[PDB]
Design a protein around this motif. Sequence first.
Motif: not given
Ligand SMILES: CCCCCCCCCCCCCC(=O)OC[C@H](COP(=O)(O)OCC[N+](C)(C)C)OC(=O)CCCCCCCCCCCCC
Length: 164
Positions: A142-143, A145, A106-108
Amino acid sequence: FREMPGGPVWRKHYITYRINNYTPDMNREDVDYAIRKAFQVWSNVTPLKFSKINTGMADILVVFARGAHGDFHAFDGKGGILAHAFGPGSGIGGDAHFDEDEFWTTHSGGTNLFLTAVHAIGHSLGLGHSSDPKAVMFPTYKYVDINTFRLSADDIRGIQSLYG
Ligand SMILES: CCCCCCCCCCCCCC(=O)OC[C@H](COP(=O)(O)OCC[N+](C)(C)C)OC(=O)CCCCCCCCCCCCC
Ligand SMILES: CCCCCCCCCCCCCC(=O)OC[C@H](COP(=O)(O)OCC[N+](C)(C)C)OC(=O)CCCCCCCCCCCCC
Ligand SMILES: CCCCCCCCCCCCCC(=O)OC[C@H](COP(=O)(O)OCC[N+](C)(C)C)OC(=O)CCCCCCCCCCCCC
Ligand SMILES: CCCCCCCCCCCCCC(=O)OC[C@H](COP(=O)(O)OCC[N+](C)(C)C)OC(=O)CCCCCCCCCCCCC
Ligand SMILES: CCCCCCCCCCCCCC(=O)OC[C@H](COP(=O)(O)OCC[N+](C)(C)C)OC(=O)CCCCCCCCCCCCC
Ligand SMILES: CCCCCCCCCCCCCC(=O)OC[C@H](COP(=O)(O)OCC[N+](C)(C)C)OC(=O)CCCCCCCCCCCCC
Ligand SMILES: CCCCCCCCCCCCCC(=O)OC[C@H](COP(=O)(O)OCC[N+](C)(C)C)OC(=O)CCCCCCCCCCCCC
Ligand SMILES: CCCCCCCCCCCCCC(=O)OC[C@H](COP(=O)(O)OCC[N+](C)(C)C)OC(=O)CCCCCCCCCCCCC
Ligand SMILES: CCCCCCCCCCCCCC(=O)OC[C@H](COP(=O)(O)OCC[N+](C)(C)C)OC(=O)CCCCCCCCCCCCC
Ligand SMILES: CCCCCCCCCCCCCC(=O)OC[C@H](COP(=O)(O)OCC[N+](C)(C)C)OC(=O)CCCCCCCCCCCCC
Ligand SMILES: CCCCCCCCCCCCCC(=O)OC[C@H](COP(=O)(O)OCC[N+](C)(C)C)OC(=O)CCCCCCCCCCCCC
Ligand SMILES: CCCCCCCCCCCCCC(=O)OC[C@H](COP(=O)(O)OCC[N+](C)(C)C)OC(=O)CCCCCCCCCCCCC
Ligand SMILES: CCCCCCCCCCCCCC(=O)OC[C@H](COP(=O)(O)OCC[N+](C)(C)C)OC(=O)CCCCCCCCCCCCC
Ligand SMILES: [Ca+2]
Ligand SMILES: [Ca+2]
Ligand SMILES: [Ca+2]
Ligand SMILES: [Zn+2]
Ligand SMILES: [Zn+2]
């Protein structure tokens, strides 16, 4: 269109589902949760009500297979087609199938079980595929979440042709 000919309406309001075996590629509870949610986000756009059982006769089976199962001994590989479920009407069909050769997460950085699972849940309910490139019931992956998931018009409007 998206709907299959041959008798595609289940006739039931209460669907019970059975996860037949879990991939070890991600945590069983995380698989349970995601498969939970993935029925329920359909439940939002259908009359149907979904309830897990660990034992007994399932409507929608959730099955991981690779190799001997009864469902193409060799197939595609890592990537490609992730799930290839079938729907009722032709005598056999209505269960969600997931090729175990994938690295299921379920992860990126792995194959997302969820958007494929929702499309497998939908094809089991009597649809085939959508033509509309923005639909979840579309074939290409495509991905997205769990938070960033939506169903599209053709998804909604295809199953309410059957269940609306
Ligand atoms: C040219 C290329 C074009 C591409 C177009 C797009 C193609 C499709 C998308 C590509 C893939 C994108 C993947 C994605 O969404 O990754 C995001 C990540 C992880 O999300 P993900 O891996 O789904 O999370 C899994 C979580 N789980 C297992 C518990 C369910 O997100 C993170 O890990 C972010 C974590 C943020 C933590 C922040 C925490 C709070 C900090 C607060 C800081 C400021 C305070 C003021
Ligand atoms: C700032 C500007 C940014 C621009 C960003 C533009 C967008 C870039 C997107 C980046 C993410 C790409 C994701 C992608 O499509 O991956 C493709 C696949 C993996 O997907 P996957 O489904 O594993 O492919 C499975 C099929 N398989 C086994 C036959 C390869 O894998 C491949 O198709 C293989 C790709 C070639 C890999 C070669 C790696 C090094 C090989 C060794 C080279 C030795 C030379 C001496
Ligand atoms: C000097 C250092 C100053 C400080 C720097 C800090 C940099 C940011 C560090 C932040 C770390 C955040 C927490 C973290 O470790 O997350 C790691 C994730 C993995 O999350 P996830 O796999 O869910 O964790 C798995 C754990 N498991 C096995 C029990 C299920 O992710 C990974 O493990 C994967 C990392 C892959 C990165 C790929 C980069 C791609 C570059 C592509 C460029 C292409 C150019 C041609
Ligand atoms: C910019 C200043 C710092 C701002 C705050 C940065 C905080 C970022 C928190 C990162 C938390 C870890 C999220 C994560 O798991 O990213 C790695 C994913 C999965 O790693 P893992 O599942 O082990 O897969 C590793 C292998 N891989 C990369 C070849 C597929 O691998 C991927 O394929 C996913 C890639 C798309 C989502 C990436 C989310 C992190 C963006 C970080 C951008 C930093 C600047 C380039
Ligand atoms: C000369 C050197 C050796 C050759 C190097 C060649 C480098 C470029 C090769 C490009 C083609 C690679 C084919 C490949 O294996 O694709 C790997 C995967 C795609 O397969 P898969 O993991 O199934 O797709 C899931 C990841 N997703 C959502 C990000 C697309 O997709 C990804 O791994 C994409 C990762 C995107 C990275 C963007 C930056 C993320 C930084 C995150 C930082 C977190 C640190 C904790
Ligand atoms: C741009 C944003 C950069 C962010 C840097 C953040 C630094 C954070 C360091 C601390 C976190 C370390 C996390 C870590 O160990 O990630 C390892 C990954 C995967 O290691 P690996 O054992 O394969 O992952 C095993 C588990 N699996 C497959 C289930 C994910 O390793 C990978 O996923 C690949 C990482 C290197 C990718 C490079 C591929 C293209 C190279 C192009 C080089 C061009 C030369 C000029
Ligand atoms: C902040 C933005 C980050 C990413 C920037 C990405 C830049 C690259 C855009 C590439 C656009 C190429 C043309 C295009 O419309 O492809 C859209 C596809 C497919 O629609 P479709 O009719 O299947 O295209 C058919 C033929 N095909 C595949 C051979 C091109 O369908 C998809 O690609 C699905 C995309 C779902 C949303 C992905 C993330 C936002 C992308 C937004 C691009 C807006 C462009 C107006
Ligand atoms: C153009 C550079 C913009 C740079 C914006 C900065 C972007 C950094 C984003 C960081 C996160 C990258 C994550 C990444 O993995 O995105 C990959 C996506 C595909 O996502 P997804 O389909 O999930 O990949 C999974 C594996 N797959 C292909 C085998 C099914 O990739 C896509 O869906 C396709 C992306 C194509 C983008 C380039 C589009 C054609 C550009 C032509 C004109 C070039 C002028 C220089
Ligand atoms: C060497 C180090 C640096 C490397 C930098 C990154 C290079 C990576 C090369 C591979 C890029 C693949 C990115 C990606 O995920 O594409 C997503 C999809 C197609 O996924 P899929 O059909 O699985 O293709 C996977 C990649 N492949 C063919 C090698 C197996 O397609 C889309 O989602 C469609 C939206 C983008 C369509 C772009 C159309 C491009 C041609 C435009 C020409 C315009 C001329 C005016
Ligand atoms: C590698 C080169 C440097 C690239 C820097 C950026 C790297 C991005 C890697 C992470 C990709 C996913 C980012 C993202 O969360 O996209 C969606 C957001 C809000 O999603 P959200 O509603 O926050 O829930 C996110 C859940 N999560 C993290 C597990 C996926 O927003 C939307 O839903 C609205 C429409 C799409 C916009 C996508 C881009 C969002 C901006 C991300 C950077 C924020 C910096 C403050
Ligand atoms: C006792 C003295 C202490 C003094 C300091 C007190 C603390 C002040 C800051 C507190 C911030 C608390 C933030 C917040 O409400 O957290 C809760 C939720 C998360 O609920 P959660 O279930 O994690 O959300 C699920 C989705 N996710 C992870 C993608 C967000 O998150 C949200 O719902 C998102 C909140 C976003 C807020 C954006 C506000 C604008 C930020 C940027 C403004 C300037 C831009 C230039
Ligand atoms: C490189 C990193 C890649 C990943 C990027 C992930 C985030 C991308 C942001 C894109 C922003 C545009 C779209 C958007 O609304 O996304 C919001 C996300 C999650 O939305 P969602 O889960 O709906 O959050 C619900 C509550 N809401 C709508 C009021 C925010 O918002 C978040 O989850 C925000 C999390 C950090 C919130 C920080 C708030 C700081 C408050 C204290 C400020 C003190 C002064 C600086
Ligand atoms: C900024 C630094 C680089 C950051 C790059 C980040 C790359 C990773 C992006 C991650 C995307 C994660 C997945 C995601 O949540 O997809 C969201 C959507 C999907 O398209 P769709 O699923 O069709 O939903 C469409 C929008 N809606 C809700 C209103 C019906 O997609 C969208 O709705 C987003 C559309 C974005 C359009 C961008 C087009 C170019 C704007 C350039 C303007 C420059 C002016 C000078
Ligand atoms: Ca059945
Ligand atoms: Ca496959
Ligand atoms: Ca596997
Ligand atoms: Zn089959
Ligand atoms: Zn689909």
